[PDB]
Design a protein around this ligand. Structure first.
Ligand SMILES: *[C@@H]1O[C@H](CO)[C@@H](O)[C@H](O)[C@H]1NC(C)=O
Ligand SMILES: *[C@@H]1O[C@H](CO)[C@@H](O)[C@H](O)[C@H]1NC(C)=O
Ligand SMILES: *[C@@H]1O[C@H](CO)[C@@H](O)[C@H](O)[C@H]1NC(C)=O
Ligand SMILES: C[N+](C)(C)C[C@H](O)CC(=O)O
Ligand code: NA
Length: 530
């Protein structure tokens, strides 16, 4: 049985068929760029304080002093969850006394925001935080919302992989793409916080599923030369485009419902891909469905205007796979044997440590000095050079050395955050941007590495499993802001240390550079051990 690459060598690397698949699978990823980090604006927290109803016709002086002031970052600003006792203030106002001149504010009774909160309109007109007052006693629900979204991503990564490796890749791709769009649509008409969180979980669950499905399907369809280009300058750059345009929508649309409408609509256009994206012939050949693979190959050859040979498969090849048409694979196969088990463990460690840093930096943009939209754009913008560098490294360098260098750069850049002077914010900003650049390059490369390592029989399952354990860090990523209380530089120290320690581990992975994609568990590379 000749390798799939040799069987379809006559189609050529570039042509109408490959070009169409390349750009339609790349286009599918823009909605993922929109959705992945939308929580930055949908779950923003505008400045707030207790509302004092206008019914209480307090004196002007008292309406200057209805709320205690506090040292929030040394800025003398109103307290966000307390007010002076309204009845007492009204009584003093009626009696004629005024703050300071007659009543000492230090002795005034304080009470919670009984009449709600007034959110500032300077940045956001409305978000879910303002919609359901996820502030003060309920401030923990926002990071909980993001954590649940990443939990949905975890579940999607786990399930979609097995579903795809069982019932093909096109079906799962389209089903979960429709899931993402549909459950994004319902969120607009959300009426309760609980329904919103459920829908958000489902949205993430479809989002990651269809991202991975498109990535794997394109990796299998396209040839060796264009595989790396598709992986790096394709899916990842189109993701970067979506992520860069997200803040553009946010800038002109300050309402979370309208913003969600804008973000969801462009994903609807993906329906047109059904009549053009075919099932992976590699996967079909693996499952033993030779007729469908042959039909797809003949269609592709006709598209490119290439005369098909007399027979795609030598009869001997057809009889060879008769025995392999019977067996089946499941999750337990990734741990049945020693070699695949070790590969899986190392891949899980790589993915977890990379994603920790990636989503730690990505979600931290709001806290950075300067305009939120500009910071978000810069965070998205810096990715494109990262993917170009990833492309170059995968093309011209061994996987191990390139991954080690990328991780080492990302870790070392962050680890030095403590040395920045206090007043030089821009130095910290560029350090964070360079760390993001390195971690993004590493994340782009790890996808290709994992895809190459696993065989086609369990390729999607393997990538999904690796992505599943990856989201543990993302789940706790929103809570890094809490850790900042202990020390501002501590989270950067931890991310850098984790990345540096990872970089060493990468040297033990098998070298897959310049190696054809395996098709069976007995063809994958052997770890340097048993
Ligand atoms: C009361 O607050 C207004 C703004 O709402 C401010 O311009 C004014 O100076 C304040 N008055 C006093 C007496 O502090
Ligand atoms: C209003 O303030 C005056 C002056 O301190 C006090 O004597 C009176 O009891 C207060 N009334 C209420 C209802 O708190
Ligand atoms: C507030 O308005 C009410 C009528 O709504 C009036 O009786 C009362 O005297 C006003 N209070 C003050 C302090 O002027
Ligand atoms: C960052 N990038 C584009 C490499 C990956 C996507 O966010 C998908 C994922 O979360 O794995
Ligand atoms: Na997509």
């Amino acid at each position: 049985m000749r390798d799939y690459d040799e069987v379809t060598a006559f189609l050529g690397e570039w042509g109408p068929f490959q070009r169409l698949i390349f750009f339609l699978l790349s286009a599918s990823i823009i909605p993922n760029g929109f959705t992945g980090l939308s929580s930055v604006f949908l779950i923003a927290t505008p400045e707030h304080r207790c509302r004092v109803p206008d019914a209480a016709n307090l004196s002007s002086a008292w309406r200057n002093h209805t709320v205690p002031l506090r040292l929030r970052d040394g800025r003398e600003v109103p307290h966000s969850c307390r007010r002076y006792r309204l009845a007492t203030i009204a009584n003093f106002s009626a009696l004629g006394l005024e703050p300071g001149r007659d009543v000492d504010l230090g002795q005034l009774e304080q009470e919670s925001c009984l009449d709600g909160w007034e959110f500032s309109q300077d940045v956001y007109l409305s978000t879910i935080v303002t919609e359901w007052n996820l502030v003060c006693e309920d401030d923990w629900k926002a990071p909980l919302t993001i954590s649940l979204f990443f939990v949905g991503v975890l579940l999607g990564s786990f399930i979609s992989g097995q579903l795809s490796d069982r019932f093909g890749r096109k079906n799962v791709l389209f089903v979960t793409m429709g899931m993402q769009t549909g459950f994004s649509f319902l969120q607009i008409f959300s009426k309760n916080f609980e329904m919103f969180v459920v829908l958000f979980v489902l949205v993430g669950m479809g989002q990651i599923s269809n991202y991975v499905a498109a990535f794997v399907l394109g990796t299998e369809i396209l040839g060796k030369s264009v595989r790396i280009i598709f992986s790096t300058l394709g899916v990842c750059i189109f993701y970067a485009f979506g992520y860069m345009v997200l803040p553009l929508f946010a800038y002109f649309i300050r309402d979370w419902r309208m913003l969600l409408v804008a973000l969801t609509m462009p994903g609807v256009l993906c329906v047109a891909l059904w009549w053009f994206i075919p099932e992976s012939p590699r996967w079909l050949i693996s499952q033993g469905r030779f007729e469908e693979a042959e039909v797809i190959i003949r269609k592709a050859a006709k598209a490119n205007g290439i005369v098909v040979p007399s027979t795609i498969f030598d009869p001997s090849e057809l009889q060879d796979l008769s025995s392999k048409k019977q067996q089946s694979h499941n999750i337990l196969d990734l741990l049945r044997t020693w070699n695949i088990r070790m590969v899986t463990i190392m891949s899980i460690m790589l993915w977890m440590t990379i994603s920790v840093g990636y989503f730690g930096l990505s979600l931290d943009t709001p806290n950075l000095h300067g305009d939120i939209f500009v910071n978000c754009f810069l965070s998205a913008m810096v990715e494109v050079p990262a993917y170009v560098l990833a492309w170059l490294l995968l093309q011209y360098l061994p996987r191990r050395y390139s991954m080690a260098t990328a991780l080492f750069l990302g870790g070392s850049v962050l680890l030095f955050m403590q040395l920045v002077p206090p007043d030089l914010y821009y130095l910290a900003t560029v350090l964070v941007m360079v760390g993001k650049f390195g971690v993004t390059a590493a994340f782009s490369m790890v996808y290709v590495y994992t895809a190459e390592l696993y065989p086609t029989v369990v390729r999607n399952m393997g990538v999904g499993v690796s992505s599943t354990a990856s989201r543990l860090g993302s789940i706790l990523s929103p809570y890094f802001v809490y850790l900042g209380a202990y020390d501002r530089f501590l989270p950067y120290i931890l991310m850098g240390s984790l990345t540096i320690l990872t970089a060493i581990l990468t040297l033990f992975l098998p070298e897959s550079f310049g190696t054809p994609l395996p098709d069976t568990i007995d063809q994958m590379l052997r770890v340097k051990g048993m």
